């Protein structure tokens, strides 16, 4: 039969991200001497709106200790920062909201965001609007630290990776209903073409594993495993359960 | 010596000037587009004739490989007259039409009678 | 005088004196490019019995292909 809708995402023809009007990739500073053995003053000049992102972007300018040139970077704007606040960064930086510092310095229960998986990749985990991570279980030997992620997973990471202290601003973004198709169309036109959302039962048999027949019924068990080939994994992909929840996660 | 920069690039090596052992075409290629080959036809129609009286301007048909400066030099080196300006168009048959307006010291009727049109 | 010793040392290419040099050369050549000019043959006996002579005009290219 025909190639399904799910297989067209890998071509990158019309399903790419709408990437021009974005301001830039939100990263931390590439780690160096001033952030591993001290701290350095930085000034947030203005916060801006990266399109396709509900979290605000912050434009923090630094000073280069090696050449006379003011370098400008793009942080994720933490909650409560304001233009003109001296955003500090480094190892021995004092714990305040906005100051990015490694997790080995901060105590347990420190609510941070925009942390790193590996030390030095400039911010990977907990970057969406209104999310945070919980820092627990430090270790003197075997430099590791548990972090509770926004999904509830407790990941053991290194002790040298960095994290901006605070939560990501823009929290509560999913509180308002979109309330019409128009704001959803403008939201997805800002983000990417992720919206040919057509029901797989309503579409044809030759184009989807579910559709067709004189009645709009699935006809097949929608719980389809991970060993299934491409064009087959539709519906519930490797579903360990279904139906209404009972507890929160029940996963060790 | 101290390498103060973390980036290593090519050193400025010595490049030799091209001093060939033999020329490669035995001779300079002669100028095919000379003064006698730039300016071909003096146009003698009604509108081209009206530019002699009412404009102090000759009309010529030029090979398309020439420009305003070569037309000006060709007129000054063939007809012994000075040129104020040269306007060029491409006539849609394929050739170039050049309206050569002369200096006010010269007379287009006299130049036309000397060239025979 | 020597090329028979070079040949017989190359034959048993699983011994410890050869496999170290072979592993070092495989690392050295894997970290190189795909097609490039080796200025002199690394196997002089094999190159000479295939037809290399040490004179101007014979060029050794070291080349890397993918197995399978």
């Amino acid at each position: 039969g025909r190639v399904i809708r799910g297989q067209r995402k890998g071509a990158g023809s019309v399903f790419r991200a709408h990437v021009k009007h974005r301001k830039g990739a939100a990263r931390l500073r590439a780690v160096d001497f001033a952030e591993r053995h001290g701290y350095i003053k930085g000034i947030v000049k203005d916060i801006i709106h990266d399109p396709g992102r509900g979290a605000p972007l912050a434009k923090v300018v630094f000073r280069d200790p090696y050449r006379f040139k003011k370098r400008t970077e793009l942080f994720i704007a933490a909650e409560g920062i304001h233009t003109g606040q001296f955003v500090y960064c480094g190892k021995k930086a004092q714990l305040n909201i906005g100051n990015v510092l490694p997790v080995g310095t901060m105590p347990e229960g420190t609510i941070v965001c925009c942390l790193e998986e590996k030390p030095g990749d400039r911010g990977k985990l907990a970057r969406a609007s209104g999310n945070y991570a919980t820092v627990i279980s430090h270790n003197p030997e075997t430099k590791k630290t548990r972090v509770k992620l926004p999904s509830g997973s407790k990941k053991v990471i290194s002790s040298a990776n960095r994290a901006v202290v605070g939560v990501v601003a823009g929290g509560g973004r999913i509180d308002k209903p979109i309330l019409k198709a128009g704001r959803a169309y403008h939201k997805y036109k800002a983000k990417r073409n992720c919206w040919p959302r057509v029901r797989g039962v309503a579409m044809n048999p030759v184009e989807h594993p579910f559709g067709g027949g004189n009645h709009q019924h699935i006809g097949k068990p929608s719980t389809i495993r991970r060993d299934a080939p491409a064009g087959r994994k539709v519906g519930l992909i490797a579903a360990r359960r279904t139906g209404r929840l009972r507890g929160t996660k029940t996963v060790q | 010596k101290i390498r103060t920069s973390p980036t290593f690039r090519r050193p400025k090596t010595l490049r030799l000037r091209r001093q060939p052992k033999y020329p490669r075409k035995s001779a300079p290629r002669r100028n095919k587009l000379d003064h006698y080959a730039i300016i071909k036809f003096p146009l003698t129609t009604e509108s081209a004739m009206k530019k002699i009286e009412d404009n102090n301007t000759l009309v010529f048909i030029v090979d398309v490989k020439a420009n305003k400066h070569q037309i000006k030099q060709a007129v000054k080196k063939l007809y012994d007259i000075d040129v104020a300006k040269v306007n060029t168009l491409i006539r849609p048959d394929g050739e170039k039409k050049a309206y050569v307006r002369l200096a006010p010291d010269y007379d287009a009727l006299d130049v036309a009678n000397k060239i025979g049109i | 005088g020597a090329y028979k010793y070079i040949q017989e040392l190359w034959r048993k290419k699983q011994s410890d004196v050869m496999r170290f040099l072979l592993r070092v050369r495989c690392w050295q050549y894997r970290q190189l490019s795909a097609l490039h000019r080796a200025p002199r043959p690394t196997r002089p006996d094999k190159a000479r019995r295939l037809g290399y002579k040490a004179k101007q005009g014979y060029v050794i290219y070291r080349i890397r292909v993918r197995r399978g």
Partner: protein
Amino acid sequence: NPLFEKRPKNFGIGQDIQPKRDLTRFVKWPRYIRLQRQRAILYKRLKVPPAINQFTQALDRQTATQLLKLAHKYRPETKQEKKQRLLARAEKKAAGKGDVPTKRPPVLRAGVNTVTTLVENKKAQLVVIAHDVDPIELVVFLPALCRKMGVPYCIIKGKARLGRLVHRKTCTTVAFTQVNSEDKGALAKLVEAIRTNYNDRYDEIRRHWGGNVLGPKSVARIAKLEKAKAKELA
């Protein structure tokens, strides 16, 4: 005296800028620089076989200076003095018609194909084996062959210095076969020390493995953990 003040700069973190330091160990080196440097480091890390750890166990510079002072006067002829001797001897045998003007020419031999033949036929009195040959397989059979044929061999560092006594870029081998009358004592004095160093210790060299040295950062880490273990045990 009037104004002439001192203007110091504080080079700490978060203040006045850092000066231009050496930056030697932090420059992005090219591919071939990294190739040869990690090649030397890889020879230091891995275990080399006992047939190539013979190399880097080589001749000291006093005996090498004595060896070069002996080898400098047995130099092979270059093209200029070769043609000079050919023209001179040809003119003398044409005019004076000399039957045997030269009895025996004393000159050494070069090249691995020549030296291996000379040690197989026991013509070699002394063998000089270069260190810096990039295919080591060309050279590895020669120490054991000179040992089993009883000819003394000395491993020397630098094939370019051996090429410059033969008027060539690389020489790789030098065989002393014929000695003069006033040089036999000096050659015996060299051969006695060379047999003391290399030939008499061949069963000692063949058992010893070379290389197997970790990086100095890892050695300092293991030494720090060893001092911590000794502090715990004491």
